[PDB]
Amino acid sequence: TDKLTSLRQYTTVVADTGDIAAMKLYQPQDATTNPSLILNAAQIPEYRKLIDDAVAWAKQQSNDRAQQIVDATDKLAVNIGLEILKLVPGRISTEVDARLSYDTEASIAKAKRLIKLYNDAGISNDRILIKLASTWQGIRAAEQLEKEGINCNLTLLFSFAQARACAEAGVFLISPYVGRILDWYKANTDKKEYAPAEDPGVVSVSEIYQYYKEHGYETVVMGASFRNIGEILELAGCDRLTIAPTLLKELAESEGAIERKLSYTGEVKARPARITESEFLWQHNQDPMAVDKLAEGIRKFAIDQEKLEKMIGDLL
Amino acid sequence: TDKLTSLRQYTTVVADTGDIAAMKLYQPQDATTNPSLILNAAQIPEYRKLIDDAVAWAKQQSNDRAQQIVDATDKLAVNIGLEILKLVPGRISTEVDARLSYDTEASIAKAKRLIKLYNDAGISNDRILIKLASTWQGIRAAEQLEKEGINCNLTLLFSFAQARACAEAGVFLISPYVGRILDWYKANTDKKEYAPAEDPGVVSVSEIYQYYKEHGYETVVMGASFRNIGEILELAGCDRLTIAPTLLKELAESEGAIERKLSYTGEVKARPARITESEFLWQHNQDPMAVDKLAEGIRKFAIDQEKLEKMIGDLL
Numbered sequence A, B: 001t002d003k004l005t006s007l008r009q010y011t012t013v014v015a016d017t018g019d020i021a022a023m024k025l026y027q028p029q030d031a032t033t034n035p036s037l038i039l040n041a042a043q044i045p046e047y048r049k050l051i052d053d054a055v056a057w058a059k060q061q062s063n064d065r066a067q068q069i070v071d072a073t074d075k076l077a078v079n080i081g082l083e084i085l086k087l088v089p090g091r092i093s094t095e096v097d098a099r100l101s102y103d104t105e106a107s108i109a110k111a112k113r114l115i116k117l118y119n120d121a122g123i124s125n126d127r128i129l130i131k132l133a134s135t136w137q138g139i140r141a142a143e144q145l146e147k148e149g150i151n152c153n154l155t156l157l158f159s160f161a162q163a164r165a166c167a168e169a170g171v172f173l174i175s176p177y178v179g180r181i182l183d184w185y186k187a188n189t190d191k192k193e194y195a196p197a198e199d200p201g202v203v204s205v206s207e208i209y210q211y212y213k214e215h216g217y218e219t220v221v222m223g224a225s226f227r228n229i230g231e232i233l234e235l236a237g238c239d240r241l242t243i244a245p246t247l248l249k250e251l252a253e254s255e256g257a258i259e260r261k262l263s264y265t266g267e268v269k270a271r272p273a274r275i276t277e278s279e280f281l282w283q284h285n286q287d288p289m290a291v292d293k294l295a296e297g298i299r300k301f302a303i304d305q306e307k308l309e310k311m312i313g314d315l316l
């Protein structure tokens, strides 16, 4: 058989898309969305119903334009999640407004709001991951949310400091990036070609996986952001991998068996003291890639939130 | 006469160097040092005495190598400052260990330590600025230090969020950058030639000046980091400008009178509520230049601190 089937021996495959067609085709365990994917899925003609339903629902919650905008955008994201959950047996990841990324209290509130919308639609918390940026503030939000029974997907994870802080916070899942790290290295160094094992994103996630397993952390490691199938294959054995339909298709069309790459077979090591905020900030900012890309990914998801709001505002 | 004399009609000229020769030649009101300048000034043959004196003093404070390293490096910076104060009637800026930049409590302690060294040498606080990075943690450190009669120079100021937070903290002085902003724009955009008025660093400091004066803030605005004399001339009227000997020389050798560029002639405007940490983080991270350059400048100054420590460690 094919490399997607072979990968699935080792790794739980997750579909990184808001498109239900992919869920039907690849029958993934979980799915991930993000504000950009929500904005793109809103353009799928067959999703016009979901948009109109979100708007109609919002208009019934209040007579305030600003609030209708927020209600409609949140309901759209949730409506898309609900369609996906009809077709995937595991989790949907739904991302909070990235404008809240440096605000712990606002992020906790938004997570609870999205959870409420799902719960009111009949979906329990065991089917949802609230996805948010792994800034210090986001990690602290997640720590509290997990204590209150809300499982999170900590994302935009670039530096080891972020990885460590997320594990120490006991978050349900992390989605550390591969592809965006490659992007940075291609843009900021003269090496524009990497063998899969030397891809800096592959190295990053591999190192994270090892750290997590060597210290007995239970946080799920889900690689995210991919540019090529080689990156994915180098991470075979990662707990989960979230992969866009384009690369799911490439894997399914690639013949051959693959070997497991990521394993931990040793003893559990004693954990350090928790990283402090000051230590986290020092260490994250040692990493010029992580500095740039965390801030950038937040800015970009925030822009897409604003674009979604503009789309919705025009329909009220 | 010359452009340096002409500039001095409008702006207090400060010498950006650890080299006493410059203080004698240009007779500046104040001087600024930084960890890189301290490392460089340590290489001036005539400063060997200052180094040997710092090491000998350190060895008398303790028999602990780690502590001697810190004591000697701090004493060297102060010894250089003391030499400069013999030749300048105003302030010396002496910068704290940049490794402390994301640690408010450690930064407060270091500032007080340096102040103690100066005070023990007979120098009062009205002659000293403790220089530190304008991270949130540094601004909070400075806010407290000012309440305790220690005047600070908040530096590595790139974003407007930083400028606003520094003003709101009531810091004695800021040293926002011009030249490093130009550096970033040349490296990250296709425009590698700027007319002085369009130089993004000039624009940054000009905007900061306007904001400070329009809201009645008393914090001194001292432009820092220069790549050419045109940048400096565009800021004629800035409260202070700290300028390296190379450009002081260029200004002194340029004939011609210059006009004042930076002025505020209006009414005092009401201040907003204080920017919160979350707002500050959001706004700072909107600025990819500021994101990169704040973290980078900290990393670089920290490296120079380590290099200084290596030099000292070798002499114990």
Ligand SMILES: *[C@@H]1[C@@H](O)[C@H]([C@H](O)COP(=O)(O)O)O[C@H]1O
Pocket (backbone or CB within 6 Å): A016, A017, A032, A033, A034, A037, A155, A156, A175, A179, A180, A224, A225, A226, A242
């Ligand atoms: C959410 C998930 O949807 C995304 C995605 O995997 C990133 O992919 P690129 O945009 O291709 O880098 O990342 C998580 O934050």
Ligand SMILES: *[C@@H]1[C@@H](O)[C@H]([C@H](O)COP(=O)(O)O)O[C@H]1O
Pocket (backbone or CB within 6 Å): B016, B017, B032, B033, B034, B037, B155, B156, B175, B179, B180, B224, B225, B226, B242
């Ligand atoms: C301290 C001061 O010494 C420096 C200096 O002005 C920066 O100049 P470049 O190194 O040429 O950009 O800046 C303050 O932090």
